Design a binder for this molecule. Sequence first.
Ligand SMILES: C[C@@H](C(=O)O)c1cccc(C(=O)c2ccccc2)c1
Ligand SMILES: C[C@H](C(=O)O)c1cccc(C(=O)c2ccccc2)c1
Ligand SMILES: C[C@H](C(=O)O)c1cccc(C(=O)c2ccccc2)c1
Ligand SMILES: C[C@H](C(=O)O)c1cccc(C(=O)c2ccccc2)c1
Ligand SMILES: CCCCCCCCCCCCCC(=O)O
Ligand SMILES: CCCCCCCCCCCCCC(=O)O
Length: 583
Amino acid sequence: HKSEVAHRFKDLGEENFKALVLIAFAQYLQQCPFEDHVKLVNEVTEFAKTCVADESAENCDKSLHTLFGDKLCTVATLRETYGEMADCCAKQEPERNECFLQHKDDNPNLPRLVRPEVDVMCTAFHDNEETFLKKYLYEIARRHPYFYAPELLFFAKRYKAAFTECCQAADKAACLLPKLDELRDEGKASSAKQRLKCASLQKFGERAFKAWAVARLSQRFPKAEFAEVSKLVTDLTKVHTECCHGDLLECADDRADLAKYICENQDSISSKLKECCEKPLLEKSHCIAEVENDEMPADLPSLAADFVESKDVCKNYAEAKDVFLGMFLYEYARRHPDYSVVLLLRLAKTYETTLEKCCAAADPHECYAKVFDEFKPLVEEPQNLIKQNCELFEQLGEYKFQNALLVRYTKKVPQVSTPTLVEVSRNLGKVGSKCCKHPEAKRMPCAEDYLSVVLNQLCVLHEKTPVSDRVTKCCTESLVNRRPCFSALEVDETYVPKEFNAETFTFHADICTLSEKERQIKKQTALVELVKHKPKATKEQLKAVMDDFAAFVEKCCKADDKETCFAEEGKKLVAASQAALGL
Ligand SMILES: C[C@@H](C(=O)O)c1cccc(C(=O)c2ccccc2)c1
Ligand SMILES: C[C@H](C(=O)O)c1cccc(C(=O)c2ccccc2)c1
Ligand SMILES: C[C@H](C(=O)O)c1cccc(C(=O)c2ccccc2)c1
Ligand SMILES: C[C@H](C(=O)O)c1cccc(C(=O)c2ccccc2)c1
Ligand SMILES: CCCCCCCCCCCCCC(=O)O
Ligand SMILES: CCCCCCCCCCCCCC(=O)O
């Protein structure tokens, strides 16, 4: 191209362009105010428009990296606000861009982003939609500088949709706040997913990843040949290693290039890519990424044939180990989209260990003949846990289910901070909600996607502030063994209970006027501190206090003098518990 700027602007459109440039600048220049970014974006946009007009005009032939970096280094407060980031401006590309990526603050020192009241948001949205949406895009972007800018642009659009629908509704808060809660929880899941994926690559390496991708891609495109899968596994690895390096343009290009190839070769991959591959560039890769599983081939044999009975089983494993175990994952995974990727890796790891031992032994077939008998319990364990948890989730509600997990987990690892025990337990209720409503097939995949995010975030938090050597064990295990380890954690016997604190169990009239979430988290917080104070307390003894307290609030939130009711009946109820259980 004569101008990289012009072509990108033309490709994206003025809106998407202005939006992405705003996210880009906000992720580097995290401490600068919104107005300063809008100034930069307007300047970079006018420059693009002049190049679109005259592609042979001044500076238009420069690389996007050079132009962005040059504009980054115009910023007056650069050395003032970041001392050794102004030292990046002394460097040529691509050392300068590398320098800029290495000076992004993973956690900036910015105040908690507060959600205004529904009426304030809806008025701001009505009165000035663009400023309200763009300021909050900037506020999120600067707090998550490694969040993939296009993905963040998609959330911004889904947020715009929620407001457009609900700010004209009869009951606005009832329409909007559930949607904003969902999008906040999907947004967090996305950032956590990006972190996990890249942390996993950096740690376990390209080989470990290739095993994951084979499994995943084989489930998604079962009608594709092992060759075509392997080819995509290779490309996707390049796409993944870049992106995880953190450059927006390289990552965007690589995802764009792969999406083009996938769409030009649909017939050799999948039939569900049709509509995805009619969508625009930015949406193309995202659509493909979130595309339905293709129907598995009608006529498929049993793996037993080529992976046990075949003459050349041990010959094939000898010739090329990784490729053969690669074929094993491919054949098993494509027959089982109902399986978690980690489950498939356990079967592959188990099959590997079997071939290692047996192909040495005198009669190989005799040895690994019953290899599938070892796969039965590995498959059955997660299938049981999911059904056992979805039964309980339905018998109770999400809330009462969260409370069940809360007691279960507090008793297992009570050294974890209350807010962590609460948020983890709450999040696993949300996993219960989403995944148990999916049909039996899509359940284990669903559970994996969210558990991976929940467990990794807990482990990240644990890395910072460690408490239990058993959480450190599960967190330092292989990703394949991480969930079963956590599942395996037993009730803590050695733990000495927490000292009683009067204020921890002191409740006020405010609890009556709090939103459902605010109320739930306060009650759940106390339920943890109760279990921490009395871990030997029986299932009967816990629901007794939980029922007694439920009657306490429901009575005292109907009283004419509510604050006095909570003071009076509160010290009464707490005292009755100190008798029922102990001080
Ligand atoms: C609703 C659902 C989702 O994402 O659709 C979900 C499932 C599990 C956890 C979370 C979540 O909120 C989370 C995000 C980041 C760190 C920890 C937990 C959200
Ligand atoms: C995440 C935060 C919340 O839920 O407290 C929030 C509250 C209200 C509005 C917005 C947005 O407009 C927005 C803009 C761009 C991307 C994502 C969201 C975000
Ligand atoms: C709202 C809060 C903050 O920004 O302080 C927060 C905490 C964690 C993750 C995220 C996100 O990445 C995100 C992205 C898009 C929409 C919603 C959330 C946001
Ligand atoms: C999947 C597994 C389960 O549901 O069996 C699970 C998921 C989340 C957490 C835990 C914990 O043991 C735990 C307990 C206390 C603090 C932190 C983690 C276990
Ligand atoms: C069904 C939703 C609630 C989830 C509760 C935890 C149960 C364990 C899930 C097992 C599947 C995870 C993937 C795996 O370990 O193979
Ligand atoms: C000294 C103990 C004081 C009371 C402890 C607080 C109990 C928390 C109850 C959590 C659940 C209440 C709601 C419900 O079960 O319907």
